[PDB]
Design a protein around this ligand. Sequence first.
Ligand SMILES: O[C@@H]1[C@H](O)[C@H](O)CO[C@H]1O
Ligand SMILES: O[C@@H]1[C@H](O)[C@H](O)CO[C@H]1O
Lengths: 140, 140
Amino acid sequence: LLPVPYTEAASLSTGSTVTIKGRPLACFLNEPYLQVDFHTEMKEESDIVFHFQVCFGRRVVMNSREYGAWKQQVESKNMPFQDGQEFELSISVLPDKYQVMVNGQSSYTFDHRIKPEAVKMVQVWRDISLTKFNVSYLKR
Amino acid sequence: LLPVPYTEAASLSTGSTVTIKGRPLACFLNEPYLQVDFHTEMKEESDIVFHFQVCFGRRVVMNSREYGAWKQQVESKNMPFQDGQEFELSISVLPDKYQVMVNGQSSYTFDHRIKPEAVKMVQVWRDISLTKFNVSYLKR
Ligand SMILES: O[C@@H]1[C@H](O)[C@H](O)CO[C@H]1O
Ligand SMILES: O[C@@H]1[C@H](O)[C@H](O)CO[C@H]1O
């Protein structure tokens, strides 16, 4: 297991993929959360280019935090995550948006509000255990 | 540090006190949570006689979960918790209600919906680290 909260310095651009494998720490009846934030600095209070928050079994909210203030969230009731199961998240940086795959299924997208090149850090936290975390760095 | 999620088998009655010392794992801008649940069985999906959930810097909700269904929550905007600080929670079982002290200050109360003798387990979880947990057992 990787430590949670998990923080890794990161850079992103079109073609980058962030892969996360983990499991919720509670049954869905107890409403565990999962949060992935792409930050503009290593500091936890820095701006967030992409905030992804799952309330397992209930909903997902996505937003940005710019100059310290939250912007307009996008709320989804799509819920591909399965109660009591390990999940694999694959986040792709496409030219126009982030695409979130859950267990290989396209499940959410979020249009860029800030260039992905502004990201310097990724944090994964809340009610999960993690077994894998990777940011790909294969493209120019 | 005690492991989080933290679970301890427990019994409560009038005069019992549950003491918890810990710290949030994130700054308040990031909205870390704290949850304390008094359960009717050791199973995490069991009923909850007293659910106490803090969204640090924002609000507190209290409720019960009976026969698998959440009842009517009580919402408070009282926020004695301080950003970036260790806190001490003291929960007293009074004849009529639970009284929650935060850093020695009376901060929330919740009238009994189910007898406290129905409790068999206490769970402390979400975005905190813990250094102390105690249930007192000094009274008849
Ligand atoms: O998760 C964030 C925070 O709760 C913020 O306070 C409002 O926007 C939501 O998307
Ligand atoms: O925290 C609980 C859960 O969110 C439930 O779904 C509704 O009641 C709230 O108090």
